[model samples]
Target chain A: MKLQVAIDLLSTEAALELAGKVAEYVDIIELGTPLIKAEGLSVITAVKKAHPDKIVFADMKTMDAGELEADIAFKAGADLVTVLGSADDSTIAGAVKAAQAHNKGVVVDLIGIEDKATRAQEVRALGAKFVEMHAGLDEQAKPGFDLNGLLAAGEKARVPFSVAGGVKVATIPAVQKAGAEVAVAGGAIYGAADPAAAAKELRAAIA
Target chain B: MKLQVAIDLLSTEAALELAGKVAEYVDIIELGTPLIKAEGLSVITAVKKAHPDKIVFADMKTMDAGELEADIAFKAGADLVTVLGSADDSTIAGAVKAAQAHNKGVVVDLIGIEDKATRAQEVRALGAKFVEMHAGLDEQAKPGFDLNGLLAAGEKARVPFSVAGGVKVATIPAVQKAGAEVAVAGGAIYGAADPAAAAKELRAAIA
Candidate 1:
């Protein structure tokens, strides 16, 4: 299993400092949706520059203008970009194509998607490289993931699966056992007082 | 009816220049989602400072951590902030409460919302002052709205309705006739060669 550590709601300088510190331990460094929304693509480029060997994912959560957004994020030095699963088929398709054209991968975020089976199938058919089963922080705080639903959808998807939202070091073992190829931790890692230690712990747990 | 011209995808200086020119004719000056993402609360504050008399809306399209986001945008000087209608119930509730606490308003965006009735009822119950029926650029470029569905949602919700996403002068009259109290234009205004004239035409149509 690979670990992706998400940094959110931090200033560019803080995020850059943390990303540089934690990049060696994590397989992918994610500039979370809030960070992307706060700093735009410049932050992505900065993170990529700081950690040239590590993969950088920009959680754009793009809902419209798929090609334009994907192109912009890729130009800003993102190795991977995400689009909302609930976005229209055309948007998802355009994003997938844009990512492919830019030599980057696409992660379709399953946030607020009711019919996981249908949406996952559509994104896979549209050429999304990864299908992320996102439990959005609010959803995690309430009723947790529908593991049964995810397992059912995972059965049908040919692409790799990623699990995110409220993932901590203690919970990572179960996530790996659940067959998640990628374990993504946001606040648990980035918001920690010791982000490097948190990243190492998560990576070790997933490994 | 009121005309809300969205200024997006521009530098703060450019957005301010365009916003100032359009503010004379438009009832509301919206710092579109891209502007909010590119520049954060500073852009919202700049627009507010430039057009103190006009209603200033920050299109944050917040999905989670609603209270924090609302407080940030509101404190930065937005009269209204937007939350995605597709967000979880807790997020919407948090945002509404935050908006109320700040003496501002929340606009629930009905973009990518599959169950309009359920979402609208949830947002209204959370005390959102306005429910925006967003067409999204992709939806607009193709066929127009599901008029029946939109009208049904409008009738069901107690809050005022704002129609948005790719609304041009030609579509303003129809949108207003469809019972929308406010008509929002994005690219049609900001992307225009003459934004001031575009704003005037939209204002006339909405009025």
Candidate 2:
């Protein structure tokens, strides 16, 4: 299993400083959704510059203009980008193509897709490289993970799978055991008092 | 019917210049999603300062941390802010309350929503001032407007609704007749050879 640590809601300097510390421990360093929204493409470039060896994923959560957005993220040094699974099918297709053209990867976020079976089929068919079984910030705040559905989707998907939203060190092993190839920890790692230590623990647990 | 002209993918200076020219003809001046994502709250402030009389709608498309996003948009001088309809129920409610507290209106964007009936009911119950029947940029490029669905949603919701995504001058009457209180045009207006004339034509059609 690979560990993806998401850095979110931090200033560019803070995110960079933390990324420098955590990059060695995690397989993927995610410039998270909030950070990308707040700082635009600059964060992607900064993170890539700071950690040249590590893979950088820009969590754009793109809903429209997939080709343009994917190009922007990839050009800014993203190895991977994400588009909303709930977005139009054309958006998914365009983003997948854009990622392919740039020799990068695209992750489709299954955030609010009510019809799990249908959406998963469409997103996978559109050529997404990864399907993220995302429990959004709100969903994560409420209760336990939707492990059953996510695990089922992961088994069904041809691509690798990631599970995100409030994933802590304690929950990493369980998610990995549940068939997640990538365990995505956001606030638990980035918002921790000791980000490097938090990331290290998560990586070790998933490993 | 009211006309909402969206200004997007342009530099701040150019967006402001265009807003000055078209503010009089349009009922709601939208600092479109791409512009807001590019320049942040500064775009909202610039548009509001340029035309204080015209209602400025900041298309924040906020998905998480609804109150904080709404506060930033409203504090930046936006008269109305948008939150994604696909967001969690709590997120929508939080945005609505934040808008009310800030003396601003909230436009819930029905973009990428699978259960329109259920979500629309949730939005209405949350006291959202308006609902935007969105055809995402990708969807707009292909088959044109989905007028029947837009009209059905608008009529059923009993809330003022706006129609957006690839809306052109030729399709303005169909959108208006479908009972859209506001017709939003983005690329059609900004991408035109003469934006002012394009905006004027849209306004004329709505009238």
TM-scores of the models, in the given order? 0.92, 0.91
Off by over 4 Å in 2: A115-118, A143-149, A156-159, B114-118, B144-148
Model 1 chain A: ten consecutive residues of lowest lDDT: A143-152
lDDT of 1 at B81: 88
Error of 2 at A116 (Å): 3.4
lDDT of 2 by residue, A30-117 (tens): 8876666556577889889988889898887888888877887898899999888878889988899998898888999887666655
Residue clash pairs of candidate 2: none
Question: How does model 2 do on interface RMSD, in angstroms?
Answer: 1.9
Interface RMSD of each: 1.8, 1.9
Location of the lowest summed lDDT over 10 successive residues in candidate 2 chain B: B143-152
